[PDB]
Design an enzyme around this catalytic site. Structure first.
Site, PDB file in Angstrom:
ATOM      1  N   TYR A  62       0.846  -1.193   0.000  1.00 39.43           N
ATOM      2  CA  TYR A  62       0.000   0.000   0.000  1.00 39.43           C
ATOM      3  C   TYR A  62       0.881   1.244   0.000  1.00 39.43           C
ATOM      4  O   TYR A  62       0.667   2.169  -0.786  1.00 39.43           O
ATOM      5  CB  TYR A  62      -0.889   0.000   1.247  1.00 39.43           C
ATOM      6  N   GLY A  63       1.881   1.247   0.883  1.00 41.11           N
ATOM      7  CA  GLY A  63       2.794   2.374   0.987  1.00 41.11           C
ATOM      8  C   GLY A  63       3.535   2.661  -0.305  1.00 41.11           C
ATOM      9  O   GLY A  63       3.659   3.813  -0.728  1.00 41.11           O
ATOM     10  N   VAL A  64       4.030   1.609  -0.943  1.00 42.67           N
ATOM     11  CA  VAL A  64       4.759   1.769  -2.191  1.00 42.67           C
ATOM     12  C   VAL A  64       3.884   2.358  -3.294  1.00 42.67           C
ATOM     13  O   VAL A  64       4.374   3.102  -4.140  1.00 42.67           O
ATOM     14  CB  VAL A  64       5.329   0.420  -2.668  1.00 42.67           C
ATOM     15  N   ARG A  78     -11.901   7.761  10.007  1.00 37.11           N
ATOM     16  CA  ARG A  78     -12.819   6.659  10.273  1.00 37.11           C
ATOM     17  C   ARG A  78     -13.611   6.223   9.049  1.00 37.11           C
ATOM     18  O   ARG A  78     -14.672   6.769   8.751  1.00 37.11           O
ATOM     19  CB  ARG A  78     -13.781   7.040  11.405  1.00 37.11           C
TER      20      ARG A  78
HETATM   21  N1  NDP Z   1      -8.891   6.346   5.764  1.00 34.96           N
HETATM   22  C1  NDP Z   1      -7.639   6.813   6.025  1.00 34.96           C
HETATM   23  O1  NDP Z   1      -7.297   6.842   7.230  1.00 34.96           O
HETATM   24  C2  NDP Z   1      -6.760   7.276   4.931  1.00 34.96           C
HETATM   25  C3  NDP Z   1      -7.228   7.271   3.561  1.00 34.96           C
HETATM   26  N2  NDP Z   1      -6.304   7.751   2.586  1.00 34.96           N
HETATM   27  C4  NDP Z   1      -6.734   7.767   1.147  1.00 34.96           C
HETATM   28  O2  NDP Z   1      -8.047   8.316   0.997  1.00 34.96           O
HETATM   29  C5  NDP Z   1      -8.682   7.749  -0.147  1.00 34.96           C
HETATM   30  C6  NDP Z   1     -10.093   7.242   0.295  1.00 34.96           C
HETATM   31  O3  NDP Z   1      -9.934   6.583   1.602  1.00 34.96           O
HETATM   32  P1  NDP Z   1     -11.162   5.972   2.441  1.00 34.96           P
HETATM   33  O4  NDP Z   1     -12.273   6.979   2.366  1.00 34.96           O
HETATM   34  O5  NDP Z   1     -10.775   5.395   3.710  1.00 34.96           O
HETATM   35  O6  NDP Z   1     -11.670   4.744   1.579  1.00 34.96           O
HETATM   36  P2  NDP Z   1     -12.817   3.648   1.634  1.00 34.96           P
HETATM   37  O7  NDP Z   1     -12.142   2.311   1.597  1.00 34.96           O
HETATM   38  O8  NDP Z   1     -13.845   3.954   2.594  1.00 34.96           O
HETATM   39  O9  NDP Z   1     -13.455   3.974   0.151  1.00 34.96           O
HETATM   40  C7  NDP Z   1     -12.633   3.751  -1.012  1.00 34.96           C
HETATM   41  C8  NDP Z   1     -13.538   4.159  -2.164  1.00 34.96           C
HETATM   42  O10 NDP Z   1     -12.776   3.932  -3.390  1.00 34.96           O
HETATM   43  C9  NDP Z   1     -13.635   3.092  -4.166  1.00 34.96           C
HETATM   44  N3  NDP Z   1     -12.893   2.224  -5.122  1.00 34.96           N
HETATM   45  C10 NDP Z   1     -11.977   1.186  -4.842  1.00 34.96           C
HETATM   46  N4  NDP Z   1     -11.534   0.634  -5.948  1.00 34.96           N
HETATM   47  C11 NDP Z   1     -12.145   1.295  -6.986  1.00 34.96           C
HETATM   48  C12 NDP Z   1     -12.101   1.178  -8.406  1.00 34.96           C
HETATM   49  N5  NDP Z   1     -11.330   0.246  -8.990  1.00 34.96           N
HETATM   50  N6  NDP Z   1     -12.851   2.023  -9.161  1.00 34.96           N
HETATM   51  C13 NDP Z   1     -13.629   2.956  -8.569  1.00 34.96           C
HETATM   52  N7  NDP Z   1     -13.747   3.140  -7.253  1.00 34.96           N
HETATM   53  C14 NDP Z   1     -12.971   2.270  -6.503  1.00 34.96           C
HETATM   54  C15 NDP Z   1     -14.472   2.260  -3.223  1.00 34.96           C
HETATM   55  O11 NDP Z   1     -15.512   1.602  -3.940  1.00 34.96           O
HETATM   56  P3  NDP Z   1     -16.551   0.626  -3.302  1.00 34.96           P
HETATM   57  O12 NDP Z   1     -17.367   1.327  -2.216  1.00 34.96           O
HETATM   58  O13 NDP Z   1     -17.427   0.142  -4.387  1.00 34.96           O
HETATM   59  O14 NDP Z   1     -15.707  -0.427  -2.714  1.00 34.96           O
HETATM   60  C16 NDP Z   1     -14.798   3.389  -2.340  1.00 34.96           C
HETATM   61  O15 NDP Z   1     -15.906   4.225  -2.770  1.00 34.96           O
HETATM   62  C17 NDP Z   1      -7.748   6.623  -0.604  1.00 34.96           C
HETATM   63  O16 NDP Z   1      -6.984   7.102  -1.723  1.00 34.96           O
HETATM   64  C18 NDP Z   1      -6.919   6.309   0.607  1.00 34.96           C
HETATM   65  O17 NDP Z   1      -5.724   5.656   0.236  1.00 34.96           O
HETATM   66  C19 NDP Z   1      -5.016   8.200   2.942  1.00 34.96           C
HETATM   67  C20 NDP Z   1      -4.598   8.192   4.246  1.00 34.96           C
HETATM   68  C21 NDP Z   1      -5.460   7.740   5.198  1.00 34.96           C
END
Ligand code: NDP
Length: 288
Positions: A193-195, A231
């Protein structure tokens, strides 16, 4: 093909992405397009926001389906003649206890986190209108992972002259290195994930140069950022901040006032830029 400005967010049926669309519907002067790979999940999210007085538009989008991406372009082109704000939020992460083999976790995390993000950019960057803003949601986990790689690798990522081709090359190598069980001999971090976040962040740097190299007059601003520990299904229940709060820095980067010319190609956390590579100043009270 429209005098109405438009903002778009990926992976916005839930989590931070969802929070971001809410704030845009409130603070952005123009239409906000919520997207999701699942239509039902996506429309439900739209309905929920309508119940707040907000009215965002919906469009399907799986950043892994190249055909899905192209259709969105078509939609945008016809409907608005372009795109003003883009927020690459979508992503996945394999947490502890998930049985999926390591090299596979590597390959799939990369496939959507980097590859997917890149395929959205190469297809939509051409459509960004002048004064446009682009936000790539990264993670500080990328920085942590960056410091775990060997000095040789660190030097390559921190370079000022690195190319999009070389970056794609390094990301792919990481995946080949894990399947061949040697990524540690090659001086890589164990964090798949980090990479991938490293790649998103370095990619943003590279994109920032190309924009000023190929569109300096268009006043477009692009930055990568970390929303903090939030969260969500990805963040877990212990996360200190809620989605509403987590979407703060991203929205901020999306609404940078017209004619600002900065920040650009920066790593932004809590509205402040942070030198690439520099570890996080502090961290939340640990409640194990
Ligand atoms: N939560 C945290 O503490 C942190 C989050 N981030 C970054 O924030 C962003 C969102 O995080 P977070 O809100 O927790 O995420 P969630 O896991 O709650 O939501 C991720 C979202 O991305 C969607 N998704 C995943 N794969 C695809 C795809 N192939 N095509 C379209 N949509 C896709 C999911 O779809 P579906 O609902 O259908 O699965 C979902 O709506 C990310 O980039 C994450 O790396 C960074 C640091 C910390």
């Amino acid at each position: 093909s429209s005098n109405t400005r438009v903002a778009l967010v990926t992976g916005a049926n839930k989590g931070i992405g969802f929070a971001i669309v809410r704030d845009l519907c409130r603070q952005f002067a123009g239409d906000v397009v919520l997207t999701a790979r699942d239509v039902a999940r996506g429309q439900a999210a739209v309905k929920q926001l309508q119940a707040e007085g907000l009215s965002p538009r919906f469009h399907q989008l799986d950043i892994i389906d190249l055909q899905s991406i192209r259709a969105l372009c078509d939609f945008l082109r016809k409907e608005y003649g372009g795109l003003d704000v883009l927020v690459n939020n979508a992503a996945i992460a394999f947490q502890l206890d998930n049985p999926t083999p390591f090299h596979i976790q590597a390959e799939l995390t990369m496939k959507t986190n980097f590859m997917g993000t890149r395929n959205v950019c190469t297809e939509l960057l051409p459509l960004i209108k002048p004064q446009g803003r682009v936000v790539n949601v990264s993670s500080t986990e990328g920085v942590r992972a960056l410091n775990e790689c060997s000095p040789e690798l660190q030097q390559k990522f921190k370079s000022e002259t690195i190319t999009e081709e070389e970056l794609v090359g390094l990301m792919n190598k990481f995946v080949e290195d894990t399947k061949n069980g040697v990524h540690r001999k090659e001086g890589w971090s164990d964090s798949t994930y980090g990479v991938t976040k490293i790649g998103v962040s370095v990619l943003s740097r590279i994109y920032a140069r190309k924009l000023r190299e190929q569109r300096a007059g268009d006043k477009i601003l692009l930055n990568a950022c970390c929303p903090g520990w939030v969260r969500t299904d990805m963040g877990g229940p212990k996360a200190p901040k809620s989605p509403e709060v987590g979407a703060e820095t991203p929205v901020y980067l999306a609404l940078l006032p017209s004619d600002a010319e900065g920040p650009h190609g920066q790593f932004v956390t809590d509205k402040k830029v942070v030198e690439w590579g520099v570890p996080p100043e502090s961290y939340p009270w640990v409640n194990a």
